[model samples]
Target: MVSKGEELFTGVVPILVELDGDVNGHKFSVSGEGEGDATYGKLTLKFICTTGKLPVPWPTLVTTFVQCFARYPDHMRQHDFFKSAMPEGYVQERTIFFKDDGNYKTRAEVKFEGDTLVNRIELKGIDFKEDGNILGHKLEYNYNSHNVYIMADKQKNGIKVNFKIRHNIEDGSVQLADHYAQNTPIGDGPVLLPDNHYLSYQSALSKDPNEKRDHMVLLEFVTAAGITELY
Candidate 1:
């Protein structure tokens, strides 16, 4: 059974769309961390929408992006990571679903460790099938300076990504962990501020021996917008 998780961060980062470079359609910030010696420090990343609608709950969407980067480093190539372990058939379908009021929904399926991590990650309202024109295949277009891939695909007008992940520790052991949403489910939900987003989390090596902690660190990419100044 898939266990429930929490949203470690509670702020938002505001950014303008990058028309060029691999960082297209994304913003950067020194987000906060919730676990380990890693404090709420600065993390750099970008999010691009290959298909479907814009005005997404970018903060929550970004969490999924960052979490994948942390969980599977080997899966990433240069700056792009496929939502699936290995590219399946070119016609493999993914889905994302989102709503108008910053309430987003959808799921991402990525293959990891030669096994299918079904419904591994999710965001509501992002219909991947609904916008397959640009997300039907892996990154194939070169924008003079940037190469784009459909790290996530589209299904039913939403967006999702199936990726290849390496969910193993250097000890050569296997691990299976789930990433999920938090209390403030929407982007417009409570957020952390740029200066205030830095946080920290504690880490352990697992005394149980039978269980290992695949997620040693948790950071938040948060900002203050659309809410009261005091919030």
Candidate 2:
């Protein structure tokens, strides 16, 4: 049997898309981070993209991710048991694709087909830092869905789990942010890990439900494309 978290991911994980004739697989290992406080609770979540790359354009990629998340509300809503949990003036539900030492620029935009293809989502912005050392940007998302889907790349066997920005806040000058992630990979403490993994504690808190917020599970499925492995 799967663990409690693994069981949750079965119905909660997003679906992979088949863009331009390519398929991708996705999964993550979560690390909860928090101490259960009024400013923030004791819950955290970090989604690790098992797949690697994709062949879709930037805009399309963002749109697809939005739809995937907008399909699973309950799974996404499991972030309330942590600190800094709020619905206003912040991101609701989203995923992030981090670059440890990669110097790639993050870009995203979203539009849904409803009563009138309204641009209800235009905030997939950069939640991570963009210093010379940390070059890659972020994607902040405020969604109401439960699941999102993504596809793989044609040339490579990886799926690019993108990021979304919230409120279009420019990088290097964020204010009044909150992190709900319970664990910071500190073994057991309130200290924020300064590794290349965590960029936004507040964002991480609202997305994951682990005990430590610092460590996220990211793996590649190049060998077993169809089989699920317990890492």
Candidate 3:
């Protein structure tokens, strides 16, 4: 039985559709800790898709992307003491679900370990799948492999985490972990994926299809907020 968790962060992040990079440092702020059931509460992440690049290249996908995360303890939000438990921390893998508007529904699960205690701050990886509605046309894409880590950053007023993610290929193939020496850049990734990852596009007008694409777009997350002041 799943324990009905409490609500944590509830805000939206800006998304770029294959942009080379957003030069102006587009808003990434944050800062959390606790050690209980670890899964008793949740945090939410949603993408604000106002850019035109959204519906065009991928018509099947909705402009919105949403996922919920399990809450951890309140003792791990400090960068100063985060490295203390450097070598003996357990990994939490949450099989997250994704959703858009009421128009389309689907589900796809990404895998990654949250609560990693590396000596320093580093990002993680994820696999995403999104299948959308039968609008003018239907667009579906498979795993857009990416290395994404939502680090708990510092903020004046107990803030939220920032997303440090990279993409285009499956990190699983590279066996990336705490010390995957390759350097990844910030901002959006060039649109691409592994050979096995496929995208499917169709016409909404052609078939009598309704959306039920829950789990259609999934992402694995590390940390996304500060809960030290959660009480």
Candidate 4:
């Protein structure tokens, strides 16, 4: 669903993500920021190592994030139903660790698989923004697979990440360029709620016969990280 709007995240840009909470005996105070578009996205996260070592490797950590944004456009856009039934429960539900807390690991239950190797990830449902503060305005596309790279030179501090994605651009036209996801969070609505959470209107778009769920995500981020103003 490519919109007619001309609001795409062009050029290298920065993004921020914050997840400060305690779940199932795991203290995850994650604050991250990085630069790039769809071609590659990097996020430097500190404080995630507070509780000993990274429960997951930098690659799996990053690749898992990219997988979260791999949702569909039609399923990601905001719906009219939210106009009245608005609530901020989703934010509290989303964490750096994928949902299903104990079930998906990050705790003593399933084991987060820190040592898991991430060779490639099938990234989908990501989109270019139509407006910075507007929700549901976007041009969406997908990347079949990509590599997730990580650097921990300062492992004591945090991890610097870079996700390499092979893009298919045709003559750099508007259609091709719109697919670029730079300087922005790739997901559905761009609107932010009360507690650094955005309205992620994705998946679950169909009804009964068409009922479905998309792997959509809306990482509420800023151009810089609050913890390190060293930007």
Candidate 5:
């Protein structure tokens, strides 16, 4: 039997897509934890069709891109920590384009041990398959650059999902455990972010994790961007 989990972080992070022919910038965010017996939750991502250099319009191109992450946690299969323990079940969704509106909500979920963790994420109206464990896989964190990288591969489809995570921080003064990392369900413990400055962006692609995907978008912290203190 599966158990229900709680909510965690709820916020937005600007992102840049670098997959295939799409290089348009996007915004990613999530809210809520796993529902019922599900191990993970939903995810919401918005992209600008005009800037996304795909063969079709943003809406049409979304379907193809969405296929890459259809299996949520699968993207991080190469990471040992993630493979050892998962959300149990997971879901995710994507929006190719959207008009500026205040109707949408945001949310996220995460569990960790030491410096490694797994997240059961859900993005409002947005929303993984695959089994088996990959031995010797674990998330690698760069204490110098503050970047976390996860590389995964799908045997049957010959698809590889590489994830690069960067938090918007000016210095090493703060740490993941100091703010975002946690062991319990997101709600059973303190909120992930004490302030908006701790925002992070996770960029993924179907290309080989060992190679460059396309373009690189770095995370930068700015105070006037409507970021608020959350302590």
Candidate 6:
């Protein structure tokens, strides 16, 4: 049986894309720096990305952060009787720091779609530190879909990627994983982890879930090709 958090990536192929065929010059990236522990009920987080790379803004960075945070606790607690206990709601005292050092502090409103959770951010009347202008765009990520469904003004695009994973003699290739490339945009999805043999990859990480390290595991497939950053 697949856990709810795992279901979020059910159709996801772990293939990364290459920038060689990027005609639009939009390169997508996500950067996260913070600590979040749901079991201890504490979180200090900050994420950043750019809207100049896409036609409109989509909160891919925000969605990835929430999913990663939720996964840490979900994986750690499964060994105990609280396996059924999940993060239904959280009250976080968060402050939004803009590019201009503009401090916009507020609490987060947590919501759940399927087993995944997201912190809904309201970016109205707020100005980024760099360019002090009322935010011109909006963004959102659907947590309950087979593939990554990002919506900005109802514009739909998708991506397709191919890759392979290894566990002993079992070759886990992320080809035709219906879940990952279900609604991808038009772009060149590269095989980031091709022929890579990870004997105990999951077990190694499961042992220590609290470590803050560069866990460069998968890639963020986007609808547009040249999106530099999404935070």
For residue 105, model 5's alpha carbon misses the true position, in angstroms, by 4.9
**What would the per-residue lDDT of candidate 2 be over residues 1-231, giving only the tens digit for each residue?**
322321222332322222221212121221111111111211222333324332221212222221212211232222211111111111123233333321122222222222111112222323334442222223222211111123332232223223333222235332222111111111122211111111121222132455233223211111011111336
What local lDDT does model 2 show for residue 11?
30
Clash totals, every prediction: 69, 56, 29, 10, 19, 18
Q: What is the TM-score of each predicted model, taking all chains together?
A: 0.21, 0.18, 0.23, 0.27, 0.20, 0.25
Per-residue CA lDDT of model 1 for 75-138, tens digit only, reads 1212212122122201122232222111233333332222212123333332233223212222
Which residue pairs come into collision in candidate 4? 37-181, 37-182, 38-181, 70-124, 71-125, 75-202, 75-203, 76-201, 76-202, 203-214
Worst 10 residues of 4 by lDDT: 83-92
Every candidate's lDDT: 0.24, 0.22, 0.22, 0.24, 0.22, 0.26
For residues 13-117, could you state the per-residue lDDT of candidate 6 as single tens digits?
121111111112333333433333333223344333322342222322222233223222332332211112123433233333333323333333333445434
The numbered model that scores best in lDDT is: 6
How accurate locally is residue 143 in candidate 5, as Cα lDDT from 0 to 100? 20
Cα-based lDDT at residue 107, candidate 3: 23
Task: Please tell me which predicted candidate would have the highest TM-score against the true structure.
Answer: 4
TM-score computed on alpha carbons, candidate 4:
0.27
Runs in model 1 lying further than 4 Å from the true structure: 1-43, 51-53, 66-102, 112-123, 126-231
What is every candidate's alpha-carbon RMSD to the true fold? 20.0, 20.1, 17.5, 21.4, 19.1, 21.1
lDDT of 5 by residue, 1-231 (tens): 111212111122122232223122223322111111112222333333233222221222222221111122322223222212232212222222221211112122333333222333332221100110101111122222222222222321111222222222233322121111212222222211111111122332222245332211112211111121336
The regions of model 3 sitting more than 4 angstroms off are 1-54, 57-68, 71-140, 144-155, 158-231
Alpha-carbon runs more than 4 Å astray in model 4: 1-8, 21-23, 39-52, 56-60, 63-102, 105-231
Candidate 1 yields a Cα-based lDDT of 0.24
Q: Candidate 2: lDDT of 5? A: 20
TM-score of 5: 0.20
